[PDB]
C-alpha cells in the first residue's frame, strides 16, 4: 500500500530521468515466482561511473527522498549502492535501495530486464529470473537474510532449463569481474540444490 505507492513514485521518477533501471528484490521475486511479503523497493540502476551515480542521487534528494545510508567499497566503482527514505506515502516511511555496483552485473540486469505490469497500471522493468537467482546466490546470508534461501527455492522452482543456464553464465560474469570475492558461487549452488 504505502510500499506500492513508493514503487509507483520511484518508477515514474527514474523513467522521467531516462535512467536504465530494473526492479530486483521482493517485487521482482514475487513477479518471477510466488508473491511474498515485500516492504521496500530494491532497484538496479546502470550508470557509467560513480560521478553519474552521485549526480543521480543529488537529483533524487531535491525530490521526495532523503539519504539514509551509502554503501562504499574499495573497487573501481566506490559507490556500490544507496539506501533512500521515501515519503511518497503517509501511512509509514518506506525504504528504497538503489544498486549501482553491488553485484557487478548491474548493466546486464538493466539491459535484460523485461516490462511487466507489476501493479494495476504500473508497467516496470523486472530483472530476469536468471539474474535474480545469481543475485540471491551472491547475497545469501542465513543469519541476516533467511528469505534469500526461500526466495532462491521459489526462483529455481519457477525457472526453465534455459533460465538455469543463463543464471550459471550470470554467475561467471559476476566472478570474472571479481564480485564473488573468494567464493565459488556455482559450487555453493550445487550444494544447496542437493538439500
Numbering used by the authors: 2 to 196
Reproduce, without paraphrasing, sentences from the article in which this PDB structure was first reported.
Members of the MenAT family of TA systems in M. tuberculosis encode a toxin with a conserved nucleotidyltransferase (NTase)-like protein domain (DUF1814) and a cognate antitoxin, which can belong to different protein families. We show that MenAT1 can function as a bona fide TA system in vivo in its native host M. tuberculosis. Furthermore, the toxin MenT1 acts as a tRNA NTase in vitro, which transfers CMPs to the 3ʹ end of tRNA acceptor stems without preference for specific tRNAs.
To further investigate MenT1 function, we first determined the X-ray crystallographic structure of MenT1 alone to a resolution of 1.65 Å. The MenT1 structure presents a bi-lobed globular protein, with an upper domain consisting of a seven-strand β-sheet decorated either side with two α-helices, connected by a short linker to a second domain made up of a four α-helical bundle. Surface electrostatics show stark differences on either face of the protein, with a distinct electropositive cavity on one face. Nevertheless, the core fold and domain structures are similar. Importantly, when all three solved toxins are aligned, the identified catalytic regions co-localise. Noticeably, the MenT1 crystal structure has two MenT1 protomers in the asymmetric unit. In addition, by size exclusion chromatography (SEC), purified MenT1 was monomeric in solution. This fits with what is known for MenT3 and MenT425 solution states, and confirms that MenT1 is also monomeric, with the presence of two protomers in the asymmetric unit a result of crystallographic packing.
